[PDB]
Amino acid sequence: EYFNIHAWDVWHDMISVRALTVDSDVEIYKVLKAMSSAKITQATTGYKGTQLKAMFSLDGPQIQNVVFKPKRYSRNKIILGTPYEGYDRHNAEIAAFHLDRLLGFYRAPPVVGRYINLAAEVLPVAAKKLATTFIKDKDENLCFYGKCLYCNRKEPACASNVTMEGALILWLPEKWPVLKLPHPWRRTYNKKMAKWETDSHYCESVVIKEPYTKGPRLLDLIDTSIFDFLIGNADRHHYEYIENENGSMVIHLDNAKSFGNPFVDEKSILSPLVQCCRLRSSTYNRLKIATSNENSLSVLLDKRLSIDPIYPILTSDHLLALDRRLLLVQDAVEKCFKEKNKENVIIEDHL
Amino acid sequence: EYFNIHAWDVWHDMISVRALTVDSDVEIYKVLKAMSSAKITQATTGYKGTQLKAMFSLDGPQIQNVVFKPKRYSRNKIILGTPYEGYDRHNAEIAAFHLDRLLGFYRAPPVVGRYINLAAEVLPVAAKKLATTFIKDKDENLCFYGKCLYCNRKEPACASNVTMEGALILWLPEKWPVLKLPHPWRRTYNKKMAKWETDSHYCESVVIKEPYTKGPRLLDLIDTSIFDFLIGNADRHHYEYIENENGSMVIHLDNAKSFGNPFVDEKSILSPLVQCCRLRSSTYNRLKIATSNENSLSVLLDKRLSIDPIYPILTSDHLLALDRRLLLVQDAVEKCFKEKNKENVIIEDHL
Ligand SMILES: *[C@@H]1O[C@H](CO)[C@@H](O)[C@H](O)[C@H]1NC(C)=O
Ligand SMILES: *[C@@H]1O[C@H](CO)[C@@H](O)[C@H](O)[C@H]1NC(C)=O
Ligand SMILES: *[C@@H]1O[C@H](CO)[C@@H](O)[C@H](O)[C@H]1NC(C)=O
Ligand SMILES: *[C@@H]1O[C@H](CO)[C@@H](O)[C@H](O)[C@H]1NC(C)=O
């Protein structure tokens, strides 16, 4: 046969240091379709971390690994309490991935929803580490509770009979190693307050040490703080970035502790933008196109979400919260304009 | 089923007024693969034109028409006579299309090689106009001779038994009508000499009438004269262009009267560049990258031709003629710099 390109090669070749994904729907739909239908050849789970998940190896000329995040809540679950509470939301990863493309960031790895038949697809290729955590619930649904720091028998992820809904997230290829640093605006995760909550010229302190003095890092974190605020992710306490000879970029990896509460907008997430009053020019241009379109951000987002196999992805309240929070980002940007003047707020760094 | 895009929609959506094709191999291979395998639902031929060809309707949700150019020569045929002598070369269309992408022009419609079973695929859907020109040759191969101006029974295109090799070229969609004008540097097609062969300030005369006074038309013809010079196409006496509200572009349509002789370089093809000494900046930049790559233009071109079903497409002598002619282009440009200074020859028109 002729003119064949395999989806896993499409994924490996589309990454550059300033873009994980591309505008082409043909290329992305090609990758999502393969993630959606590829045979699972191995399945396991790990001891590190606090969240229950699995790792699937998908078939192909070369094997492609994905993270599998199971459904843990109904679509109408409300996550209150602490801004960080609870299990990762599989539908939030899907929504965040498409919103990252819609806003032109292109910094999130592909995510697809999928209904996994645990009996037919997982058990016949499961590692012992995963298989030994399968149990049944009170209604004889098939479940597993995994291994991880907080994983235990009383908190399983349960299928509906044997069919488990979840999200698949592509591994980045080995050519693109990921580095992790603490976020200057991370929270304390106790009762004390962080420095940025008490200090208000805190950005002046950040820009003094590297890597925030020169280069794209601080504008990336401001981009990502806008993205995290719109989805309600208050828990990027450590950020991750790729890097080569041509630069670096903070990536939107693991966005699942989001879309937990459609009734509150956590403006503290916007602290990098509000305190620094710097904004990358290309980001600003796309934000004003988004507010001046005749279709709101959420109308455009749900059109993209309607292609995913497990759609509906978000309830209408989260969609309207997006549009409300986009206006709040515009307001924060304008306040930076008032108090430092536009031509000192908008930075054209050609990214 | 999920994430489906049909190839004919990929073709219709990728065209803009300054690019018929795109850099994405995924999108282009998707279209080429469909051309390679699509069922032929209709076949005909016309009275207009000078060259024997057919028109095929390919199946799909919508019908997609292609021009079919049959093989007429061996790969190693040396075509002597006038610079424009002979039949259309089917393999030249394939090579010219991939070179158009390799050089970054993106002005050529997709072309694929294909082996056509005339008995099974063409005859049962052939219109009478085409069917009545089918004959057998002295070795009982199935052939057809068409109804064009020079088409006649003594000059048929013949298959091997019933399998006919040829090239398929996509029609532009109806949304992109093509307009034709005489080329200011066209030949006389007699033994008289054309005005540009006698005068040496001829370009000065061209730029005074429209559409050569302003806009992209003249730099397009200089681009296309470089492209035609590399492939040996001395027969673009009329050029064709697309146009809408955002501009216009001369397209590389019908490139088959090329690669006729790998040992002769007809420098008269470069007359628009040599006489005008203007060169679009982006074209110059890509030409300089092509000469400084560690892999020659012909090595990179043959790697792309190796995916086509009827490969080998060009003999190594035509591949090396490409590299030879690229240096001759550089010489002509450097001569323009010496006699008008570089910054009056390189025009940055942002195209
Ligand atoms: C679901 O459970 C029923 C029994 O209620 C069984 O008949 C059926 O085969 C199960 N379906 C799957 C996909 O396991
Ligand atoms: C960095 O950019 C240059 C220029 O586009 C490119 O040639 C090079 O391959 C890039 N770096 C890597 C590691 O690919
Ligand atoms: C193909 O053509 C040859 C003539 O060269 C003929 O003898 C033969 O029977 C044909 N065979 C098939 C399988 O079409
Ligand atoms: C380019 O022209 C097309 C119509 O030919 C139009 O739809 C489009 O809006 C134009 N581009 C821009 C950026 O306005």
mmCIF file of N, CA, C and O in Angstrom, chain A residues 165-211:
data_model
loop_
_atom_site.group_PDB
_atom_site.id
_atom_site.type_symbol
_atom_site.label_atom_id
_atom_site.label_comp_id
_atom_site.label_asym_id
_atom_site.label_seq_id
_atom_site.Cartn_x
_atom_site.Cartn_y
_atom_site.Cartn_z
ATOM 1 N N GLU A 165 -15.192 4.082 31.592
ATOM 2 C CA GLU A 165 -14.937 5.332 30.895
ATOM 3 C C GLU A 165 -13.685 6.004 31.452
ATOM 4 O O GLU A 165 -13.407 5.936 32.652
ATOM 5 N N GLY A 166 -12.907 6.621 30.572
ATOM 6 C CA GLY A 166 -11.748 7.361 31.030
ATOM 7 C C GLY A 166 -11.138 8.193 29.923
ATOM 8 O O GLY A 166 -11.682 8.298 28.821
ATOM 9 N N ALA A 167 -9.991 8.793 30.235
ATOM 10 C CA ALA A 167 -9.242 9.610 29.291
ATOM 11 C C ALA A 167 -7.866 9.000 29.049
ATOM 12 O O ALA A 167 -7.207 8.535 29.987
ATOM 13 N N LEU A 168 -7.436 9.013 27.789
ATOM 14 C CA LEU A 168 -6.105 8.574 27.382
ATOM 15 C C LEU A 168 -5.276 9.801 27.028
ATOM 16 O O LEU A 168 -5.743 10.666 26.278
ATOM 17 N N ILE A 169 -4.068 9.896 27.582
ATOM 18 C CA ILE A 169 -3.158 11.006 27.302
ATOM 19 C C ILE A 169 -1.856 10.434 26.755
ATOM 20 O O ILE A 169 -1.241 9.570 27.393
ATOM 21 N N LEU A 170 -1.426 10.925 25.592
ATOM 22 C CA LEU A 170 -0.190 10.436 24.983
ATOM 23 C C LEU A 170 1.021 10.767 25.846
ATOM 24 O O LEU A 170 1.139 11.875 26.377
ATOM 25 N N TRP A 171 1.926 9.799 25.986
ATOM 26 C CA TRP A 171 3.274 10.105 26.456
ATOM 27 C C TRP A 171 4.003 10.985 25.443
ATOM 28 O O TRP A 171 3.886 10.787 24.231
ATOM 29 N N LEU A 172 4.783 11.939 25.939
ATOM 30 C CA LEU A 172 5.746 12.610 25.076
ATOM 31 C C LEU A 172 6.841 11.623 24.672
ATOM 32 O O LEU A 172 7.258 10.794 25.486
ATOM 33 N N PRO A 173 7.333 11.686 23.440
ATOM 34 C CA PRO A 173 8.397 10.764 23.030
ATOM 35 C C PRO A 173 9.681 11.005 23.811
ATOM 36 O O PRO A 173 9.882 12.045 24.445
ATOM 37 N N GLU A 174 10.553 9.996 23.770
ATOM 38 C CA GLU A 174 11.796 10.042 24.529
ATOM 39 C C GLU A 174 12.674 11.218 24.105
ATOM 40 O O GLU A 174 13.415 11.770 24.925
ATOM 41 N N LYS A 175 12.585 11.621 22.835
ATOM 42 C CA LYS A 175 13.342 12.758 22.318
ATOM 43 C C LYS A 175 13.033 14.059 23.060
ATOM 44 O O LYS A 175 13.837 14.998 23.008
ATOM 45 N N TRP A 176 11.911 14.135 23.776
ATOM 46 C CA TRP A 176 11.479 15.362 24.445
ATOM 47 C C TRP A 176 11.359 15.138 25.948
ATOM 48 O O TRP A 176 10.248 15.057 26.489
ATOM 49 N N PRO A 177 12.483 15.057 26.657
ATOM 50 C CA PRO A 177 12.415 14.894 28.111
ATOM 51 C C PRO A 177 11.811 16.122 28.773
ATOM 52 O O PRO A 177 11.915 17.244 28.274
ATOM 53 N N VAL A 178 11.165 15.886 29.910
ATOM 54 C CA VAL A 178 10.407 16.905 30.628
ATOM 55 C C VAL A 178 11.134 17.219 31.929
ATOM 56 O O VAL A 178 11.513 16.304 32.670
ATOM 57 N N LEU A 179 11.331 18.508 32.205
ATOM 58 C CA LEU A 179 11.965 18.964 33.435
ATOM 59 C C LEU A 179 10.950 19.688 34.310
ATOM 60 O O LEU A 179 10.077 20.398 33.801
ATOM 61 N N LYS A 180 11.080 19.517 35.627
ATOM 62 C CA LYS A 180 10.124 20.027 36.603
ATOM 63 C C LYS A 180 10.797 21.006 37.558
ATOM 64 O O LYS A 180 11.904 20.754 38.043
ATOM 65 N N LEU A 181 10.125 22.123 37.826
ATOM 66 C CA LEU A 181 10.572 23.113 38.797
ATOM 67 C C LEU A 181 9.397 23.555 39.658
ATOM 68 O O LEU A 181 8.243 23.491 39.218
ATOM 69 N N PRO A 182 9.657 23.999 40.888
ATOM 70 C CA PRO A 182 8.570 24.547 41.710
ATOM 71 C C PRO A 182 8.031 25.846 41.126
ATOM 72 O O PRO A 182 8.782 26.685 40.623
ATOM 73 N N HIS A 183 6.714 26.001 41.194
ATOM 74 C CA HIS A 183 6.065 27.203 40.687
ATOM 75 C C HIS A 183 6.223 28.338 41.689
ATOM 76 O O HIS A 183 5.826 28.181 42.850
ATOM 77 N N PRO A 184 6.777 29.497 41.286
ATOM 78 C CA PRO A 184 6.925 30.623 42.223
ATOM 79 C C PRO A 184 5.623 31.026 42.904
ATOM 80 O O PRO A 184 5.642 31.603 43.995
ATOM 81 N N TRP A 185 4.484 30.724 42.280
ATOM 82 C CA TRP A 185 3.185 31.067 42.847
ATOM 83 C C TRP A 185 2.460 29.849 43.414
ATOM 84 O O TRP A 185 1.233 29.872 43.556
ATOM 85 N N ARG A 186 3.194 28.785 43.740
ATOM 86 C CA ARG A 186 2.586 27.610 44.348
ATOM 87 C C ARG A 186 2.019 27.954 45.723
ATOM 88 O O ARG A 186 2.452 28.899 46.387
ATOM 89 N N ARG A 187 1.042 27.161 46.154
ATOM 90 C CA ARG A 187 0.406 27.347 47.449
ATOM 91 C C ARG A 187 1.176 26.608 48.544
ATOM 92 O O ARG A 187 2.074 25.805 48.280
ATOM 93 N N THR A 188 0.803 26.885 49.796
ATOM 94 C CA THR A 188 1.510 26.288 50.926
ATOM 95 C C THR A 188 0.999 24.891 51.259
ATOM 96 O O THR A 188 1.761 24.074 51.786
ATOM 97 N N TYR A 189 -0.273 24.604 50.965
ATOM 98 C CA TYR A 189 -0.900 23.318 51.294
ATOM 99 C C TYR A 189 -0.871 23.057 52.799
ATOM 100 O O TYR A 189 -0.624 21.939 53.260
ATOM 101 N N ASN A 190 -1.126 24.119 53.559
ATOM 102 C CA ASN A 190 -1.329 24.062 55.004
ATOM 103 C C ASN A 190 -2.154 25.308 55.393
ATOM 104 O O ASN A 190 -2.915 25.805 54.612
ATOM 105 N N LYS A 191 -1.945 25.779 56.636
ATOM 106 C CA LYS A 191 -2.726 26.906 57.134
ATOM 107 C C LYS A 191 -1.991 28.232 57.006
ATOM 108 O O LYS A 191 -2.641 29.283 56.976
ATOM 109 N N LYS A 192 -0.665 28.199 56.926
ATOM 110 C CA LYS A 192 0.140 29.376 56.651
ATOM 111 C C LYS A 192 -0.150 29.897 55.242
ATOM 112 O O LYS A 192 -0.717 29.201 54.395
ATOM 113 N N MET A 193 0.220 31.153 55.005
ATOM 114 C CA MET A 193 0.074 31.778 53.703
ATOM 115 C C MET A 193 1.414 31.863 52.986
ATOM 116 O O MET A 193 2.466 32.041 53.605
ATOM 117 N N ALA A 194 1.361 31.720 51.664
ATOM 118 C CA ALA A 194 2.555 31.848 50.838
ATOM 119 C C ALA A 194 2.948 33.316 50.696
ATOM 120 O O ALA A 194 2.157 34.230 50.943
ATOM 121 N N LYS A 195 4.202 33.528 50.306
ATOM 122 C CA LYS A 195 4.736 34.887 50.198
ATOM 123 C C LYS A 195 3.944 35.740 49.221
ATOM 124 O O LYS A 195 3.735 36.932 49.473
ATOM 125 N N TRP A 196 3.506 35.162 48.103
ATOM 126 C CA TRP A 196 2.778 35.958 47.127
ATOM 127 C C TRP A 196 1.406 36.385 47.638
ATOM 128 O O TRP A 196 0.817 37.311 47.074
ATOM 129 N N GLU A 197 0.885 35.731 48.685
ATOM 130 C CA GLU A 197 -0.393 36.135 49.264
ATOM 131 C C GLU A 197 -0.263 37.348 50.186
ATOM 132 O O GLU A 197 -1.238 38.084 50.375
ATOM 133 N N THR A 198 0.915 37.561 50.780
ATOM 134 C CA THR A 198 1.196 38.675 51.684
ATOM 135 C C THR A 198 1.926 39.809 50.980
ATOM 136 O O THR A 198 1.547 40.979 51.109
ATOM 137 N N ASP A 199 3.005 39.484 50.281
ATOM 138 C CA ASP A 199 3.683 40.452 49.439
ATOM 139 C C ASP A 199 2.822 40.770 48.222
ATOM 140 O O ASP A 199 2.090 39.921 47.712
ATOM 141 N N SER A 200 2.928 42.006 47.746
ATOM 142 C CA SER A 200 2.204 42.408 46.553
ATOM 143 C C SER A 200 3.120 42.890 45.437
ATOM 144 O O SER A 200 2.674 42.965 44.284
ATOM 145 N N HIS A 201 4.384 43.197 45.733
ATOM 146 C CA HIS A 201 5.416 43.376 44.722
ATOM 147 C C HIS A 201 6.212 42.103 44.543
ATOM 148 O O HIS A 201 7.388 42.137 44.168
ATOM 149 N N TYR A 202 5.563 40.973 44.814
ATOM 150 C CA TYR A 202 6.239 39.691 44.784
ATOM 151 C C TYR A 202 6.860 39.400 43.425
ATOM 152 O O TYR A 202 7.909 38.748 43.355
ATOM 153 N N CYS A 203 6.248 39.874 42.336
ATOM 154 C CA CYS A 203 6.836 39.626 41.022
ATOM 155 C C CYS A 203 8.221 40.252 40.912
ATOM 156 O O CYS A 203 9.117 39.680 40.277
ATOM 157 N N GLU A 204 8.413 41.439 41.498
ATOM 158 C CA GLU A 204 9.744 42.041 41.506
ATOM 159 C C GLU A 204 10.782 41.097 42.098
ATOM 160 O O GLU A 204 11.930 41.075 41.644
ATOM 161 N N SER A 205 10.397 40.306 43.102
ATOM 162 C CA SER A 205 11.328 39.347 43.688
ATOM 163 C C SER A 205 11.602 38.176 42.752
ATOM 164 O O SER A 205 12.722 37.654 42.729
ATOM 165 N N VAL A 206 10.601 37.752 41.977
ATOM 166 C CA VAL A 206 10.760 36.579 41.119
ATOM 167 C C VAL A 206 11.741 36.867 39.994
ATOM 168 O O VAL A 206 12.623 36.053 39.692
ATOM 169 N N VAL A 207 11.598 38.026 39.355
ATOM 170 C CA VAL A 207 12.365 38.378 38.165
ATOM 171 C C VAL A 207 13.839 38.599 38.487
ATOM 172 O O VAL A 207 14.635 38.892 37.589
ATOM 173 N N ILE A 208 14.218 38.477 39.761
ATOM 174 C CA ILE A 208 15.602 38.763 40.129
ATOM 175 C C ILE A 208 16.492 37.549 39.897
ATOM 176 O O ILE A 208 17.635 37.686 39.447
ATOM 177 N N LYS A 209 15.995 36.351 40.179
ATOM 178 C CA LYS A 209 16.762 35.145 39.906
ATOM 179 C C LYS A 209 16.318 34.473 38.611
ATOM 180 O O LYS A 209 15.207 34.679 38.112
ATOM 181 N N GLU A 210 17.217 33.653 38.083
ATOM 182 C CA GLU A 210 17.004 32.879 36.873
ATOM 183 C C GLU A 210 16.162 31.663 37.235
ATOM 184 O O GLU A 210 16.248 31.176 38.368
ATOM 185 N N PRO A 211 15.366 31.146 36.281
ATOM 186 C CA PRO A 211 15.274 31.507 34.859
ATOM 187 C C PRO A 211 14.223 32.565 34.506
ATOM 188 O O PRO A 211 13.763 32.590 33.365
#
